[PDB]
């Protein structure tokens, strides 16, 4: 684009009119030199920091680095706190407030005199929500990731965030660990500022952002307390000023190819299943046609090479020390699986960015022959039970369970599950299929991460830690097991999942991508005719708004009226 | 000057040696991009903020504004807290630690990789102490003033900092006010972040800094919490980087002409007597020949036109709104008393900065016809009692007392005074001369602001609030009355003041600049023969160091081994 | 002591006088509720944070944590910035400004209304300089250490702070590495906020603070960016308020026993040689009789069990995860070598604090059988060459060099050394003794860490990396080799070291604690007769003060007039 030119912030701050005297004069009460309103890029630094978002605890100091960079490049930096949907505080689930966060971000951007955006994110649902909001404005934007926590250590051994919550709690149910020992582990599990240090959702979404080209190279893996995280933040501050001048917009970066690069990256790293929903939602904002079939297709026969929990052994520190995501992206290029010419926020192509990096640890970023799985991409299951699709993360599942037929053990909701699961009178064995409903977008509500249901204690005492599980819910990115997720349509909207009964047989067949409830179309069709929504609905408030407008996980679980891009035209003046 | 060139910071951060890797590498742990060490000006921002220095409470936020300006200008800002000698916490007196602070500042500057300096100052002693330290290095330096507090208001009346402490305490002694009423006034006396809102030492030194050309024009009068204080700091941050390139040094700015400009400014503003000691000390660092005689000469027949307490009516707020110090400097120019070509830190002459300013209130910045005093300059008294000189601030004195002879009422020290003053049986009247000794640099020690001795209550009960007072001490800039100060040599070093006895007659004659003890040289000389250093002396610590090396107030009360400029040569490498 | 009682802060803030209205009133301009001045403990938080002290870069956030704790316990926290003598910025050497910092800290404490002190430290000289200053006031005080950096990783290998600076520079001289490769290591050498991650001076002095009982248990080893460092800081804030009420003073904690524990602790950890000088200096403030002989005696036959660089293999991270210093103190207790009843700041004895801790890594905190050295205590050498003493760190020395005789190759100063050392024509081999003079307190000046002289490059290419070296200088705790240090009296004051000549033979015998110059007794005396203070001496400034008043390393290199405790009596009133 042409520079110099009149930027949208000048609608507020350029001129001699009464409106400009009002806008410019009031901001000046914070002590800003007059020439800051001379047309230089005005940068909105969107911060998801909060004392109730400990994964983002260091983001104010990151903001200062960003500010410094904007000043250096001759911009005008303004820190703007935005809704922070922390995974670790919000109940019923942070997922329920992602669209709310996305909405407020969109309005904060379009409604206020900023010419460009810096997206300060970290905790799980902060990355997609700001990406959704910024994409729906399509102003020049760039991502700064907070970074993972340092490795957790318990009794001289590695402890992964979230992953060891499942492991220890299941060990306790098996009688192989006491709750007292579990409590002792708490202190040294989260011992620095940052996000979960496994390949969970936050680490995955950081990787997607970088793989999408919406963040500078090397952004994802640097630990929150690492010095180079701050270097990154300041360098990002410099870049956004130039991006605003060059008018480098999200639509030019997040293309279909870019999303394809992102999906294969998810396969290579063995990333969270939540990335599926989040990418679909974000794609729905950019205006790109992206579907579950694209995920299944692109991820097919792409091996996981990142050896981190829950799929592998190590943590984000080792991943970073090995060389981080650029090494992974370079490998994808070498396999001919990368759209090498994909443009990034640096103004350079993704390949030009990563082509010369070195793998410093092949025990962490494995050679292709030694992949944890040959086809690491999340798999999309189709069938009478999931007509709109369901997902599974193969790199953390059990090979002997990937093809499996068993009797359905059914839970009507999470309350139903929690009441039955620890009961020794529960008619269930290791060959049964655990099935749960009413845990989707509308059902839970908000679609909580309860898909990785803990096994029956009497099964766990046999040393059996994996069983086939199916639901219309999510599970933590740090979670594992042969779990089928995002079953669409959910039970709460009358999907076939609603009418699953104890005793019914279910066939799981991942290689053929099929999930089959073994009853006749006749029996199924008549079951659905008698269906009713036996869940509690809200009468007012945001819970109500959510219940009315939220879509299925198969499309990204967005709000129907929030889909698409609405541009960044400046609204009418207030007086 | 030449730019680009190799700056002194490159001695630390320039090159490829182990030591540079050491120096540069360690600083990088705070997350600094490599190019910050490329030779661009590295700015040391010396902050005198402290929680025990409430007058500088907002200097941390002001440091940030300076930082932003340095970033904008392409420099490398680094905040460095320095010794902060607060007037309101330090005992026996903040004055005793001025040289200590000055000592520490000099070493912090020369020993560390800064190419230029920003001096964040406010409370009384902070401004000169940082100026002394910086002058003895002569790197490009610039002053940022914290600023005065807002006006205090008590019971529908303006209350000035410090000035109403003397007034109320004397009113309580006069029985015209209760201590209870005094305590109630405290809450609304200091009600914003900043320094004393009268023409005290802080406001005076702020004006001296600007009058010397060591601060951007308009620096002195801006209130601490006013938005334009923040604008100023950021602009200062921009300017210091250019000053480093141009190598604009204090020695080039603080010339004899500048010090003369400062003196006439002090007269015009009716500034504190403490400016004498501070300017003499600062002159002693730059290497400028400045004496008490210079003070007397330059200030003579310079009228006070600034109508602020303790001399006048209003406060720093009105002074700022009237137009502040630039209006005052312009008036000096119109009277032909200004060295118009004196260079300032802005690169412009003092006249070029002030030549176009407007007086917005002549009730505050008075016209020459309406001046408070025609010869407002501090007067230097000579004579047998003050062989090396003594001073008095005429603009806060009583006209009928400037020429006066009276019986001496003698106090041997502050303890003696405190024991005798409130005794109704004390033989004293309004015509007596109150005399106190052993309150100088060595005597007190530290030369406290105890010179403005409260009058005997039986004299105050006559509605008489002024008496002739003589001592070797200082007094607050907020203080008033016909008080003779800085009597040199002090009694503790055997000055004639030491042997004054009750009954002796004392002649005060300001127009003839004379201070005479009316006894024969024979009687005086024989009295001195019996003099001894009648004090309990310290054997160690800084108090001892002070006792051994401190000079008289007639030369600025510096430490003998601290006088002069020692340059800014980098010492040997540490490794 | 009895509570409630009148604390020293009440001299400022307790009562109804004019002075109290002044003192209390001014601090109120920063927005403090009145009851904060009711006599509750006023805590001075002494912060050595500075942008030019990157090792203490995160101390403001710890200061905030300390503040929160003080509030909780019902105190009145006030942050007070103090002089920060960073090893990595100050030249000629930070050591020259350790005493300057101690003076300023002392005066800031005694001169201001604080009832207790929190010492925020990190970088080498910050800990002892503040401990000296606080000890000379003897108010209730407690230490918070910033904490070490994370491990440096370059090309999949551990890099220790400082230690690998010496190693690589010698490797480059040996031709085993290029300088270009050295620069690539810079980025990943210091990659988090904190001090050297080896057992350097900072880690040593941090351990001394904890071993003395002047910090909460576990304070020394916690990484700067670890969450529990912040927990530590807040708990310290709570504790200091209680310490002030109980009046728990440094003199009660830093007893002869406490210093003995610290010395024995230093041996176990294989700590820096600088701990000798610093402990001697600090003991001289408390008024405890401590000498070099105490060091020699207490350290003899105490084995180093800490497996960290430069003595061992690992870094402070591994040390912390293993259990840190409490485990080390426990082992001394188990060996019967600990003064178990020594009181600590927690109000409990050191044994009560550590007796139940667990060793989580026996490869890092070694069992006695696998100690690096059997007698790990620093050894004191005596003889004609060092009549007042010299020291050596055995755990990082070469066993085969501990008893050794060789031709002395003499360098007259650091300039002499650097001019000759890299010359291939220099007559020297692996059996010669490298000797350098004029690097002591007065000589250098400031006694730099240059004692570990790099070997001749032609010697290094033979694979010989250690030589016996002698000087009057210091060396980094991160340094290693058979190096003789702190030779007293120094050459600059006419010590026998001054008259050493090329060709002289020197006998080193650590078991017999002897250092012998092989010349006749007569020849030495006549050599000294020709000695002159052949240095460029300062004529003014602090450099002059240093030259006039600094003592030898044999007593801690303090300033002679600063020794001892001068108490904390509140000074005379300021008005
Ligand atoms: S909760 Fe923030 S990343 Fe797991
Ligand atoms: S008290 Fe700080 S300026 Fe008067
Ligand atoms: S330099 Fe600050 S700790 Fe080593
Ligand atoms: Mg989650
Ligand atoms: Mg004063
Ligand atoms: Mg050291």
Curated annotation (Swiss-Prot), chains A, B, C:
SUPFAM superfamilies: IlvD/EDD N-terminal domain-like, LeuD/IlvD-like. It comes from Rhizobium leguminosarum bv. trifolii (strain WSM2304). Coiled coil: none annotated. GO terms for molecular function: 2 iron, 2 sulfur cluster binding; D-fuconate dehydratase activity; galactonate dehydratase activity; L-arabinonate dehydratase activity; metal ion binding. InterPro entries: Dihydro-acid_dehy_C, ILV_EDD_C, ILV_EDD_N, IlvD/EDD_N, Sugar_Degrad_Dehydratases. Keywords: 2Fe-2S, Arabinose catabolism, Carbohydrate metabolism, Iron, Iron-sulfur, Lyase, Magnesium, Metal-binding. It catalyses: L-arabinonate = 2-dehydro-3-deoxy-L-arabinonate + H2O; D-galactonate = 2-dehydro-3-deoxy-D-galactonate + H2O; D-fuconate = 2-dehydro-3-deoxy-D-fuconate + H2O. Its EC number is 4.2.1.25, 4.2.1.67, 4.2.1.6. [2Fe-2S] cluster binds at residues 55, 123, 196. Pfam families: ILV_EDD_C (PF24877), ILVD_EDD_N (PF00920). Belongs to the IlvD/Edd family. It comes from the Bacteria. Homotetramer. NCBIfam families: PRK06131.1 (NF004784), PRK13016.1 (NF009559), PRK13017.1 (NF009560). Its cofactor is [2Fe-2S] cluster; Mg(2+). The lineage of its organism: Bacteria, Pseudomonadati, Pseudomonadota, Alphaproteobacteria, Hyphomicrobiales. Catalyzes the dehydration of L-arabinonate to 2-dehydro-3-deoxy-L-arabinonate during L-arabinose degradation. Can also dehydrate D-galactonate and D-fuconate with good catalytic efficiency. Has weak activity with D-xylonate and D-gluconate. Mg(2+) binds at residues 87, 124, 449. This is L-arabinonate dehydratase. Optimum pH is 8.0. Pathway: Carbohydrate metabolism.
